[PDB]
């Protein structure tokens, strides 16, 4: 069920990322693993791997990992490479990271970015706690932009 979100950005599950043939077939060399329990695939290089060590629940905190996750995805983009963002099921933790990436990159509202990812991977269903952290993330980007002279 591997989903291409942008040409350099895929969203998927643990089963996707551990499928060597699927990964090699699609030339995916970077992995952003949003989980504590999912393993790095043996066939992925440490320098092309990043973990966001979070559990999927109503109290887990994703906010301060968002800017570094986005930076990682842009490192792949600069290297002309594709990155997959995944968690266990690829419907909550990883999905929220993909949504935040689109928000920041395109200056899209959290509503529109959620819909953008949801349209391409209809199975996503991020828990409300993560969706709320997206709202707070957007609020903070708007204040950062304000300082840059963009009210």
Q: Which domains does the chain have, with CATH numbers?
A: 1-151 (3.90.190.10)
Identify each DSSP E strand in the chain by its residue range.
3-6, 9-12, 28-33, 49-51, 82-86
Smallest CA-to-CA distance from 81 within 2, 9, 3, 15 is with 9
Query: Could you tell me the two tokens for 95?
Result: 């999905």
Measured CA to CA in angstroms, residue 123 lies from 54, 102, 126 at distances of 20, 18, 10
Query: Could you tell me the two tokens for 58?
Result: 């109503």
75, 8 Cβ separation under 8 angstroms: no
Query: Could you tell me the two tokens for 40?
Result: 């790095």
Query: Could you tell me the two tokens for 118?
Result: 């949801």
Query: Could you tell me the two tokens for 43?
Result: 């066939």
Q: At how many Å resolution was this determined?
A: 1.9
Query: Could you tell me the two tokens for 112?
Result: 């529109």
User: 3-state DSSP: the chain helix, strand, coil percent, rounded to 5?
Assistant: 50, 15, 35
Smallest CA-to-CA distance from 55 within 41, 36, 71, 68 is with 36
Q: How far apart are CA 66 and CA 64, in angstroms?
A: 6
Measured CA to CA in angstroms, residue 71 lies from 32, 47, 93, 105 at distances of 11, 14, 17, 11
Residue linked to tokens 């929220």: 96
The full DSSP string for 81-109 is -EEEEE-SSSSSHHHHHHHHHHHHHHT--
């Amino acid at each position: 069920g591997l989903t291409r979100i942008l040409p350099h950005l895929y969203l998927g599950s643990q089963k996707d990322v551990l499928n060597k043939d699927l990964m090699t077939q699609n030339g995916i060399s970077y992995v952003l693993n949003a989980s504590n329990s999912c393993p790095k695939p043996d066939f992925i290089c440490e320098s092309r791997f990043m973990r966001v060590p979070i559990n999927d629940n109503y109290c887990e905190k994703l906010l301060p990992w968002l800017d570094k996750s986005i930076e990682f995805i842009d490192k792949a983009k600069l290297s002309s490479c594709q990155v997959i963002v995944h968690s266990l099921a690829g419907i909550s933790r990883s999905a929220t990271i993909a949504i935040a990436y689109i928000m920041k990159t395109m200056g899209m509202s959290s509503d529109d970015a959620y819909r953008f990812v949801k349209d391409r991977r209809p199975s996503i269903s991020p828990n409300f706690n993560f969706l709320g952290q997206l709202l707070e993330y957007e609020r903070s980007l708007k204040l950062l932009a304000a300082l840059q002279g963009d009210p």
